[PDB]
Symmetry: D2
Subunit: 235 residues, 4 copies
């Protein structure tokens, strides 16, 4: 199977796989059963922003999510990503719906990785504030599309803007990312994305994740709903 490190914005509490009984932000290390969660006051139909940060000195994966006019939610987990992930990875966004549903709309997505050696800097940076019909520097998987209202729709939306159930889709940056090099004295990354999660229902599902994977990563079979397009099962 794929190797996955993810930050999840989990809109639907599945308490039998260890979700808390509310929408939550979580850190996922090779399992949909988050190593750490925090309560998330998700706002149906409002534009949110998530920030993810990590460096190889501190070995702490941290994330913050907020809306305008609202308090933030934050979560952290101590993990050395050089012991979890391979040297080369792809970075992406993933979302799903199940029998409960929501839009998984991405308005913007930025990523920066830096490797400083003892010589110094290797860097990759991308920023999307608009997506075109044919976004050649993304790999779209499953139901993901680009260019509707200039946005990235990770899951299926009807012509009327209405979200569909039982949907899964991801977008990965085309270029592999080098997150470990033998001469690096500091390796760091940060990601930001802005999202619009909207549902006609009181119980939206299932969420959006930022993820880092082996470069050949694909949507596992049956990873709609609670598995967020990331994991083949709930182990």
């Amino acid at each position: 199977a794929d190797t996955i490190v993810a930050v999840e914005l989990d809109t639907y509490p599945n308490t039998d796989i260890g979700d808390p009984s509310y929408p939550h932000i979580g850190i996922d290390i090779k399992s949909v059963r988050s190593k750490k969660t925090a309560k998330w006051n998700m706002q149906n139909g409002k534009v949110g922003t998530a920030h993810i940060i990590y460096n190889s000195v501190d070995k702490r994966l941290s994330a913050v999510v907020s809306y305008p006019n609202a308090d933030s939610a934050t979560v952290s987990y101590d993990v050395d990503l050089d012991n979890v992930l391979p040297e080369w990875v792809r970075v992406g966004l993933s979302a799903s719906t199940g029998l409960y549903k929501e839009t998984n709309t991405i308005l913007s997505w930025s990523f920066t990785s830096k490797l400083k050696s003892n010589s110094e800097t290797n860097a990759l940076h991308f920023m999307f504030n608009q997506f075109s019909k044919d976004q050649k520097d993304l790999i779209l998987q499953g139901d993901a599309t680009t260019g509707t209202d200039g946005n990235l729709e990770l899951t299926r939306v009807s012509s009327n803007g209405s979200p569909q159930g039982s949907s899964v889709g991801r977008a990965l940056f085309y270029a592999p990312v080098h997150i470990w090099e033998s001469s690096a004295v500091v390796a760091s990354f940060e990601a930001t994305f802005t999202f619009l999660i909207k549902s006609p229902d009181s119980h939206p599902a299932d969420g959006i994740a930022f993820f880092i994977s082996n470069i050949d990563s694909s949507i596992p079979s049956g990873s709609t709903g609670r598995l967020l397009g990331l994991f083949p099962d709930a182990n």
Copy 2:
């Protein structure tokens, strides 16, 4: 054939295809016969730096090359790159040798492209200050290799560090680059590379170019020597 826009650091004067009678920097628009050149006081065995800049407001492709302790050479040419290049491109470095030869060593390579819309910014940035044996975010073509002394060798070098004749190689960034979008009010790019051109001979050949191409670009047949791995002929 491929569509090529290049800046050439041309080490060897081929006066029958319109080179001036000295090493020169040139702007190449779909032809090895530069639209504009400037004299270049090339220094055998010294580390140089080239800078390339362009924006869609000015529509002027400009370049500067220098060595420490030396004056610069500069060249400019008025060209609208939206009338020459497709919407999506790849960016790369190219070099060649012929019956005369030189090392075509790249120590560092950076590129930034920005598209600002009327909404604003889509950006791509990469920086290499070291190259590994397996550089997964480059496409290496012909004789190009990575990881020898942490460098990119565009043309064949022996174990002893000695340059080979009749060699051609290129490196392209893995991800396609979006240089025109319908909503963009300003589109800009800049590139920098540092190079070491060394030859045991008084007459080194043939040079190094920064180039922008159709995304599927490959080394044309018989593009060693004066054609710089860029053009299938001297038209």
Copy 3:
């Protein structure tokens, strides 16, 4: 007197000092009588964005202004800023009202200057997306205030949000900016600001400018209205 290079968003046509008979974007070199103008379809009460770019290779000062859902206006002028401005400068925003009036609200302001030598990079960058009551890295002159709705108000606004006539104010970045150095092979800058110009009247006045000045620059006496807080007279 001060030395001023400015890009003006001129909301009010003063045809006796050579304004065209419509709102316009202009390039001002040591005179309120623009060296070049373009028609500007100014939108009362809409958030706009202006971009300014320059480099020492091309010696061309260019600007673009747009609103969401609208075409852009652009203007360019060939000028070597090393022949106009001193080696060290301050960068700022300026606005005014007269007997006609408007808000001169700045929501965001970014600036980047780079000097690349033949050794390479000296850089300054700042970005404001929010302004606090006490913004210690700005010099506020005349009626300029910060922190109202998190914004920079260049000219006087009442508690009710209503613009006042006969007002002039500027904001300069605290740190001097080095725009020429003897070893530089390329010197470049870019600025962006987003603005909200709103008036209860069919004829708003007078406009907003991005400017570069001697470091000790101050608001000239009687530079309300058509002189934009930049010039002591209309010569």
Copy 4:
């Protein structure tokens, strides 16, 4: 007295104020008696690089120092800098000599601070790779000079390049830096400097520090030698 947070490259072991018995990197919170140290294999006459990183989510101040061809030294300390430093600060470099001496030469210095709100980004960035005689965007204190070989000499050097004893000097960036804002959901900074510490003696002294201070910070009386131009005493 001033409020100081510093990372020290301490070349001389003063074991009565808790230095370990070797050159060391340390984290200084309002005291020259480091809260944490690591052994530093200082190399007389070699160019080194130090990196400093912090963010308000992790609340961990970390630093790495290396030379080409050598292993790194790293130190970290958990500290919330919003509980130590005021909202607005200045950032700088400091060095000293005593009865033992060394050059405290700075070849390059970069700093980036970002405040992301829930609206997002306020940023400051500067990069020096060359220093001029009259560097108007630095405040030089005590014996610090700029422009000798294009470098920043923090402590007194003779015309012959020979370091002087009993010397203290600092350089602060001219513009105040905003490191806390009420709407910020993440605040981060990183600093890098490259240094050349050279001495004709087997026992160089005293070291170089990167520091953050109240904006009006000045060299305390009698802060030559072991106090590094940072502290008025060894408490």
